[PDB]
Amino acid sequence: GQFRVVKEPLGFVKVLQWVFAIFAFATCGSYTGELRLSVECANKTESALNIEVEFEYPFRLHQVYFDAPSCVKGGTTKIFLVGDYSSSAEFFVTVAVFAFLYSMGALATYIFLQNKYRENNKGPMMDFLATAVFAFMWLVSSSAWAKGLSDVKMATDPENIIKEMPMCRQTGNTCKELRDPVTSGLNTSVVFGFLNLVLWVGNLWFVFKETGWA
Amino acid sequence: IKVRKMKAIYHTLNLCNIDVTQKCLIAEVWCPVTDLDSIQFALRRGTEHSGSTVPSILNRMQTNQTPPTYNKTNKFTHGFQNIVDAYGIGTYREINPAPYTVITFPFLFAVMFGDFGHGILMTLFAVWMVLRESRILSQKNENEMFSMVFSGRYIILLMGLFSIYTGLIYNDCFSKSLNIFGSSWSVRPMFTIGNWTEETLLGSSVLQLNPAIPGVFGGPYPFGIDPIWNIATNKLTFLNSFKMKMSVILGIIHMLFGVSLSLFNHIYFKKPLNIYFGFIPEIIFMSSLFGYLVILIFYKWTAYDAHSSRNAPSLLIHFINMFLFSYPESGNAMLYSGQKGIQCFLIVVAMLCVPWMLLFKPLILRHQYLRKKHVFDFGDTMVHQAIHTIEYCLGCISNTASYLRLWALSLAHAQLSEVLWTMVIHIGLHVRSLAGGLGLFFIFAAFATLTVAILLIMEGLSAFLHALRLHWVEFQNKFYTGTGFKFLPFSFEHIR
Amino acid sequence: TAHSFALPVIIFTTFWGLIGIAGPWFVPKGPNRGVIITMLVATAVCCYLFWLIAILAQLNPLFGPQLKNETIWYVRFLWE
Amino acid sequence: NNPEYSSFFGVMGASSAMVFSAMGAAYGTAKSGTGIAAMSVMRPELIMKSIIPVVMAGIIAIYGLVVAVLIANSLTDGITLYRSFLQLGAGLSVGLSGLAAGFAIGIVGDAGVRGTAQQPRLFVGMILILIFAEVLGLYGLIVALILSTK
Amino acid sequence: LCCGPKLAACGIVLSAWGVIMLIMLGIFFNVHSAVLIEDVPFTEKDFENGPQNIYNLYEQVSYNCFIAAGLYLLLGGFSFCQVRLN
Amino acid sequence: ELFRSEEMTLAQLFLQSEAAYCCVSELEELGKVQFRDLNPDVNVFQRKFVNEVRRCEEMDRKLRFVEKEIRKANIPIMDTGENPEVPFPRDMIDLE
Numbered sequence A: 001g002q003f004r005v006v007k008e009p010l011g012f013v014k015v016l017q018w019v020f021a022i023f024a025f026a027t028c029g030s031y032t033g034e035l036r037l038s039v040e041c042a043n044k045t046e047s048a049l050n051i052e053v054e055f056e057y058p059f060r061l062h063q064v065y066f067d068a069p070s071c072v073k074g075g076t077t078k079i080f081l082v083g084d085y086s087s088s089a090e091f092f093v094t095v096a097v098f099a100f101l102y103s104m105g106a107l108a109t110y111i112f113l114q115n116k117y118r119e120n121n122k123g124p125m126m127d128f129l130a131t132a133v134f135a136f137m138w139l140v141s142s143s144a145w146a147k148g149l150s151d152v153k154m155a156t157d158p159e160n161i162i163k164e165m166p167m168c169r170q171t172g173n174t175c176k177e178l179r180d181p182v183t184s185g186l187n188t189s190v191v192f193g194f195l196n197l198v199l200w201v202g203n204l205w206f207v208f209k210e211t212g213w214a
Numbered sequence B: 001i002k003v004r005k006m007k008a009i010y011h012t013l014n015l016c017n018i019d020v021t022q023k024c025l026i027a028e029v030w031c032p033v034t035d036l037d038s039i040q041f042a043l044r045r046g047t048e049h050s051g052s053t054v055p056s057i058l059n060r061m062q063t064n065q066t067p068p069t070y071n072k073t074n075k076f077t078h079g080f081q082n083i084v085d086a087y088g089i090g091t092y093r094e095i096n097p098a099p100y101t102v103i104t105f106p107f108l109f110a111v112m113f114g115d116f117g118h119g120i121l122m123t124l125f126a127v128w129m130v131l132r133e134s135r136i137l138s139q140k141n142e143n144e145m146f147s148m149v150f151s152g153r154y155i156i157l158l159m160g161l162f163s164i165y166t167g168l169i170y171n172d173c174f175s176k177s178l179n180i181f182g183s184s185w186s187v188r189p190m191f192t193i194g195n196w197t198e199e200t201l202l203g204s205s206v207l208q209l210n211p212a213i214p215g216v217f218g219g220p221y222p223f224g225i226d227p228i229w230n231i232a233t234n235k236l237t238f239l240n241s242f243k244m245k246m247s248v249i250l251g252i253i254h255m256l257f258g259v260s261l262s263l264f265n266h267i268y269f270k271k272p273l274n275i276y277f278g279f280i281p282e283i284i285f286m287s288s289l290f291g292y293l294v295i296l297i298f299y300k301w302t303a304y305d306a307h308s309s310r311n312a313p314s315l316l317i318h319f320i321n322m323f324l325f326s327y328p329e330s331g332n333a334m335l336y337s338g339q340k341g342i343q344c345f346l347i348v349v350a351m352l353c354v355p356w357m358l359l360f361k362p363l364i365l366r367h368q369y370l371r372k373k374h375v376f377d378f379g380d381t382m383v384h385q386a387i388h389t390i391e392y393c394l395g396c397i398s399n400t401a402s403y404l405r406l407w408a409l410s411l412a413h414a415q416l417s418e419v420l421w422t423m424v425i426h427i428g429l430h431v432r433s434l435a436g437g438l439g440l441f442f443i444f445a446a447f448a449t450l451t452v453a454i455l456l457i458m459e460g461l462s463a464f465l466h467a468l469r470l471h472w473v474e475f476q477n478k479f480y481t482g483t484g485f486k487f488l489p490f491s492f493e494h495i496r
Numbered sequence C: 001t002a003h004s005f006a007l008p009v010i011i012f013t014t015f016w017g018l019i020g021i022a023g024p025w026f027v028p029k030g031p032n033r034g035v036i037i038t039m040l041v042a043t044a045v046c047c048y049l050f051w052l053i054a055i056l057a058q059l060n061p062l063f064g065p066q067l068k069n070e071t072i073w074y075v076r077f078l079w080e
Numbered sequence D: 001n002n003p004e005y006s007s008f009f010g011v012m013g014a015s016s017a018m019v020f021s022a023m024g025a026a027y028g029t030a031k032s033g034t035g036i037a038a039m040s041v042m043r044p045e046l047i048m049k050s051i052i053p054v055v056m057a058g059i060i061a062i063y064g065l066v067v068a069v070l071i072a073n074s075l076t077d078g079i080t081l082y083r084s085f086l087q088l089g090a091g092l093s094v095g096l097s098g099l100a101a102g103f104a105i106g107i108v109g110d111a112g113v114r115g116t117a118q119q120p121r122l123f124v125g126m127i128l129i130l131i132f133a134e135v136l137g138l139y140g141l142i143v144a145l146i147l148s149t150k
Numbered sequence E: 001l002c003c004g005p006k007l008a009a010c011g012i013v014l015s016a017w018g019v020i021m022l023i024m025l026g027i028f029f030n031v032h033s034a035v036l037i038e039d040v041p042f043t044e045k046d047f048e049n050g051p052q053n054i055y056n057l058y059e060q061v062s063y064n065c066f067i068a069a070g071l072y073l074l075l076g077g078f079s080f081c082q083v084r085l086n
Numbered sequence F: 001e002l003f004r005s006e007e008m009t010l011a012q013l014f015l016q017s018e019a020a021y022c023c024v025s026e027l028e029e030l031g032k033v034q035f036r037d038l039n040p041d042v043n044v045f046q047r048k049f050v051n052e053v054r055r056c057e058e059m060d061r062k063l064r065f066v067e068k069e070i071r072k073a074n075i076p077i078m079d080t081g082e083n084p085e086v087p088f089p090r091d092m093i094d095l096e
């Protein structure tokens, strides 16, 4: 066991990359949000005083639905959220999962087969290739996840939901919110993605130096 | 091997002159120009081995006899070269259809056999044959069918690849689409802006969808046919038209490429007569009558949308009216301003190209070969040119029609795959009880055998041979002659 | 689900144009340079024509898909 | 509203698409089997290669079955005269096209099995003719798929 | 149980095809792909409240597909053992 | 290349009889030469070397018979891959 390899600056970078994107996977893939609204129609008896909705991490929001009040005859109209950002959320989650698996494999190789990894610099070259690929993936995914988080905050926003709801277009109907989703998890995930991108960018130079191309 | 070569060599020397004329043997041979030095070096080896002091001597001589057709075939190009040679060995030094066939035969095959899954199966099979080719080449068998397929392994490989591509474009995989980017058809705007409700869903068995209301149709699918058409009962209504237009477009462009190749042939052979009467009249006729049809198809696609659906003209009727000069004041309106004048001009040019081909060339030939220098038979020449013009003009129509076999075979393959799926593995999938997972075993065994037999083997063979027929007739009648002789060298194949 | 007809057309046109135009200048020199160039150009032309026909045929639909009521009900929930 | 007899034409179209295709494929199979039996007494090694025309007759039968199944799954109680007669036309198209294609396949295969027995090179020519004979019935099926889903 | 190598090869190729295609079909059913809605064995009652019932039936069909894939995996293993025997 | 057929040309060779066999053997190995009948007046079955070709055919028959006995027996037939040239000198007597 070459624990000195882990303790070395490159090993520290690998350990940091393992902890990061794993923090991101935990923050994102475990995200579960709830929203609460209320509608008081012209007749109070038909008021939807409390309507609650829940959504998961994948952000397939267009699937999420709820039976809002119609304010006429006491009926209900099914309303769905607008747009989904799975293409970005799942992409970032998969990138983070792949990064975590690669970090675990690299740590295992350095601890056990560091000599084989360093042999002929072929392992350093493969590490440099993976580092460039991961840097590009992180650069794309950080922006994708930030845009997804902003647009999800917009779409899940009770203000926007009420504005789009046709109940407000009626006479006397009043729609209000009760709670908003916790954006702390999404913000932390975005910050962790940016940190992982920075770590990969920094490790690019370390890999280049190790491979001798410096 | 020793005795077989010895026999072959003596039988070859039989063909050479004998001492009845000279003690030194006389040999006559065809040879490519570049290999003359190599042949001389081979003769030098022969002299050294025989020990004869005198050296054998080779000599060129300007000739009149027709040289053979030699194509310097390769391992990858052997299948395609045999494929194009089947319908007649090309003449000496004319545009060879093989290099273009190398792609257009797999592509035309894929336009019909288009299916992602079946293409995957075919490319895997062709890759197995390619990889294990040395093994099978060593282990020879008498199975004619298998020998044919193996010789065509590269043909099958390219056919599989292009079939994969066309299956992706059709969004077809074992009769089922993919939806990898997301459909442009959203059903919610129908209830939001449109006039629907759960009551309408209960009341209508099949209903329908419209893109006129804003959010239903969010642009075209970025790559291939939209997945929703797979589940739409309106599938055929749209696929039929799209595939008919595709078939006509591809056929007309292929024929135009053939005519350009014919121009190349004439330029190389130095037949300005053919270039100025023949090709140019032919290309003008073809483009004006049928290329204009492709332009019309593309223009209608780009112009007419849902809002203008009501008064969207039918290009079939418009082409009929173009030919009949039957532009009416009632019915579907004109596609674009000036259609009457432009179409009349196009028809006039098209019909003028018939006299252009027919009358001109015979008259110039008769002039410059019977009034100058003074056997030429003017009546026979006129009859021959009339036959050629009638043949070409009727051929344009009949070939643009026959290229519809692309759509016919594609739709047939798609419908046969759909019915096979729904009649075989729908049985194993539409079972509530978990015990169905065991039934799916045998049901899918039947599905696999049926796909390999009915579809991969027989429908694939039909599509292959119809791409072949298209290439032989529709494409190659424009520039190919195929009145040469295969170069059969004195090469030792007794290795068998 | 808004599928703009700018990104797909630009991406596919540039990709197939590269394959069919730049690739002939990159093919290595040898006996098969001509045949390989022909395959590159012909594949570019054919594949691009097929894809363009498909995308245009889908563009500007004069009628929408006809979906059974069960599948319309399911698609409302699932698809965007 | 609609006549109680409106479904008769659709039912008969499905029945025709099946029956006439079956008759054409039966003729193809019978003629090809006669040719194969006559040939095999001298060239036993060509039976498997020469079994192709029988397979193409089976393919004609398969087209007939497909169109019959489509029409039979499209029949409904309130089937209007329009749909009923569309399905009748599709059935007639498939049935008669498969009938004629099967006749041609049977005759050509009976000729070409014996011919290939004598001249090995004739096998590919026989296959070439047979594929045309089969796509005749395919054209019938194509028109049927256009009609029954008009 | 010795048998013909041709039959063993056919069995193994069919096993590979079945495993791959049925695994993909199960994955798609589990993802609830709307393309395969016709293959779900649902009834009129399943359209009562929401899509959860149809999702459950999708999952059931996916389980059937995975069971078939596992059976074909066993069949391919038997064919591979027969090949090793031959 | 495959664009169009190769430039083709006739040629005629004077070669002394003694070395003619070896020279045509080298040509056969090379494979880029196509001879033509230059004595079509007399049929093939009467040409000069018909005696030689007849004896070669008899040798081929002998080899076919021995090979058939080989197949009848379980003994296998080797495969080296060498392609030696027929001996131009009168090694036919030794082979016979």
Ligand SMILES: CCCCCCCCCCCCCCCCCC(=O)OC[C@H](COP(=O)([O-])OCC[N+](C)(C)C)OC(=O)CCCCCCCCCCCCCCCCC
Pocket: B078, B079, B080, B082, B083, B086, B121, B122, B125, B145, B146, B148, B149, B151, B152, B153, B155, B156, B452, B456, B457, B458, B460, B461, B464, D124, D127
């Ligand atoms: C798991 C299954 C996956 C699917 C795989 C099968 C896909 C279905 C389509 C395959 C069609 C195969 C035919 C084309 C290949 C032959 C072309 C070629 O390159 O050879 C030149 C062939 C044969 O090669 P050749 O012997 O001429 O080679 C040249 C040799 N010299 C120069 C010495 C003469 O040449 C021709 O005669 C050209 C005409 C070919 C026309 C093809 C006719 C149809 C043949 C049908 C084959 C049998 C049907 C399938 C049965 C399967 C069951 C065992």
Ligand SMILES: CCCCCCCCCCCCCCCCCCCC(=O)O[C@H](COC(=O)CCCCCCCCCCCCCC)COP(=O)(O)OCCN
Pocket: B074, B075, B076, B158, B161, B162, B164, B165, C019, C032, C035, C036, C039, C040, C043, C044, C047
């Ligand atoms: C799935 C979606 C995509 C589908 C559409 C694209 C399909 C393209 C199909 C062509 C690819 C396969 C080519 C054959 C591979 C086997 C090689 C055989 C032997 C070989 O090297 O052939 C040479 C001919 O050139 C060659 O082998 C040609 C190689 C280079 C061709 C480049 C053109 C490829 C297509 C365009 C680019 C890709 C587009 C899709 C992304 C000459 O034979 P030899 O010297 O070895 O012979 C040895 C004895 N004489």
Ligand SMILES: CCCCCCCCCCCCCCCCCCCC(=O)O[C@H](COC(=O)CCCCCCCCCCCCCC)COP(=O)(O)OCCN
Pocket: B256, B260, B283, B287, B288, B290, B291, B292, B295, B296, B299, B303, B335, B336, B337, B338, B342
């Ligand atoms: C080897 C290759 C051989 C050739 C292959 C190609 C086939 C060639 C066919 C013949 C020549 C080209 C076609 C000529 C016929 C007219 C084509 C009209 C196309 C069309 O629909 O355009 C609309 C009309 O254009 C207008 O409104 C403008 C006026 C009408 C058209 C003017 C002529 C344009 C073509 C010029 C010749 C091109 C030659 C190509 C070889 C666009 O108009 P819109 O929708 O905006 O208007 C509508 C409201 N008013």
Ligand SMILES: CCCCCCCCCCCCCCCCCCCC(=O)O[C@H](COC(=O)CCCCCCCCCCCCCC)COP(=O)(O)OCCN
Pocket: B100, B104, B253, B254, B257, C024, C033, C034, C035, C037, C038, C041, C042, C043, C045, C046, C049, F001, F003
């Ligand atoms: C509207 C849709 C349809 C459009 C189709 C027409 C437009 C595309 C084709 C236009 C012509 C392209 C260029 C022609 C060849 C010019 C010669 C130089 C080409 C080049 O750089 O490569 C040389 C090899 O070319 C060669 O060996 C020959 C290359 C020939 C390229 C064209 C063949 C594909 C056309 C068919 C399209 C597919 C069918 C459409 C349905 C290298 O020079 P080198 O050293 O090899 O010297 C030559 C002898 N060896």
Ligand SMILES: CCCCCCCCCCCCCCCCCC(=O)OC[C@@H](O)COP(=O)(O)OCC[N+](C)(C)C
Pocket: A086, B117, B120, B121, B124, B173, B174, B176, B177, B178, B179, B180, B181, B182, B183, E013, E016, E017, E020, E021, E024, E025, E027, E028, E031, E032, E033, E034, E035, E036
């Ligand atoms: C022997 C050699 C081996 C042969 C190999 C053959 C492989 C064949 C495997 C497939 C066969 C079955 C075909 C079924 C295809 C339908 C599956 C499908 O549609 O996929 C995609 C769906 O999951 C997703 O789409 P959705 O959930 O509707 O929408 C959500 C999609 N967004 C998020 C992108 C918008």
Ligand SMILES: *[C@@H]1O[C@H](CO)[C@@H](O)[C@H](O)[C@H]1NC(C)=O
Pocket: B193, B194, B195, B196
């Ligand atoms: C009623 O239905 C028609 C026909 O589809 C539609 O155009 C119109 O917008 C609808 N009116 C409403 C929902 O008020």
